[PDB]
Amino acid sequence: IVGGYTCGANTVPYQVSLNSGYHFCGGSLINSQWVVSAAHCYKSGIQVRLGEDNINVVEGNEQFISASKSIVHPSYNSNTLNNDIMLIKLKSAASLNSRVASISLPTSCASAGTQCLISGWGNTKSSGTSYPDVLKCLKAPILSDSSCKSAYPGQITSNMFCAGYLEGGKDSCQGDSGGPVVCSGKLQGIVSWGSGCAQKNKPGVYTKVCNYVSWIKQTIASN
Ligand SMILES: [Ca+2]
């Protein structure tokens, strides 16, 4: 997250870190056994880390649970990142508590202009590299479809939305991929892609989770 703030330990209790020997992507806990992330975060051998603040210190509220299964969307296209969503099943249910908690899936799609909370352990520099140890947060508004298509001509599908600031300076970034975009208390986006981070006229692009609720529900009813 570039231009964000330190969230505060466990104030984003549905945020997970995906670890393959190191943090590589975020995700969102949607119930005690399942995490939503981006399909471009797929790796074999994923451990889900819940209850994290500092990803480099064991502070006492973590649960580390191996994934048993990962399910990339059946229509994921890694070239265009259309349908950039994945489900990850935990080998054992998380113990839900004040610091490890699920986020609701949406009933309705979020509105343009809504300010959402985006979080993660990704790079904090627009130019260069610096990865934080503690979770960062950003409030960013959803942009209109026509603004998002003007920013990325011939690249935005109906399963993507843009959020952020066209002036630059505030965005999600590498290492935040797969993490949540929460709007009015529901998981509405997944950190997916963008041209650089926090560059002028190049806002973040996010997977539109409200288009996938039927898939998520039928997949979790079957696995
Ligand atoms: Ca920790």
Curated annotation (Swiss-Prot):
Query: Is Protease one of the keywords?
Result: yes
Q: Name one GO biological process term.
A: proteolysis
Pfam families for this protein:
Trypsin
**Record's SUPFAM superfamilies?**
Trypsin-like serine proteases (SSF50494)
Residues annotated to bind Ca(2+): E52, N54, V57, E62
EC number(s) recorded for this UniProt protein: 3.4.21.4
What is the activity-regulation note? Is inhibited by scorpion cyclotide trypsin inhibitor TopI1.
Entry PTM: Subsequent cleavage after Lys-125 leads to alpha-trypsin. Further cleavage after Lys-170 yields pseudotrypsin. A cleavage may also occur after Arg-99. Not sulfated on tyrosine residue(s).
Give the intrachain disulfide bonds: C7-C137, C25-C41, C109-C210, C116-C183, C148-C162, C173-C197
> Origin, by domain of life?
Eukaryota
Query: What keywords sit in the KW lines?
Result: Calcium, Digestion, Disulfide bond, Hydrolase, Metal-binding, Protease, Secreted, Serine protease, Signal, Zymogen
**Gene Ontology annotations for the cellular component aspect, listed alphabetically:** extracellular space; serine protease inhibitor complex
The transmembrane residues are: none
Molecular function as annotated in GO? endopeptidase activity; metal ion binding; serine-type endopeptidase activity; serpin family protein binding
> What range(s) does the Peptidase S1 domain occupy?
1-221
**Active-site positions, per UniProt?**
H40 (charge relay system), D84 (charge relay system), S177 (charge relay system)
Q: In which tissues is it expressed?
A: Synthesized in the acinar cells of the pancreas.
Give me the residues that bind substrate, please. Answer: D171, S172, Q174, G175, S177
Report the cofactor remark. Answer: Binds 1 Ca(2+) ion per subunit.
SMART domains listed in its UniProt record: Tryp_SPc (SM00020)
Q: Which family does it belong to?
A: Belongs to the peptidase S1 family.
Quaternary structure, from the entry: Interacts with SERPINA1.
What's the protein here called? Serine protease 1
Q: Which organism is it from?
A: Bos taurus (Bovine)
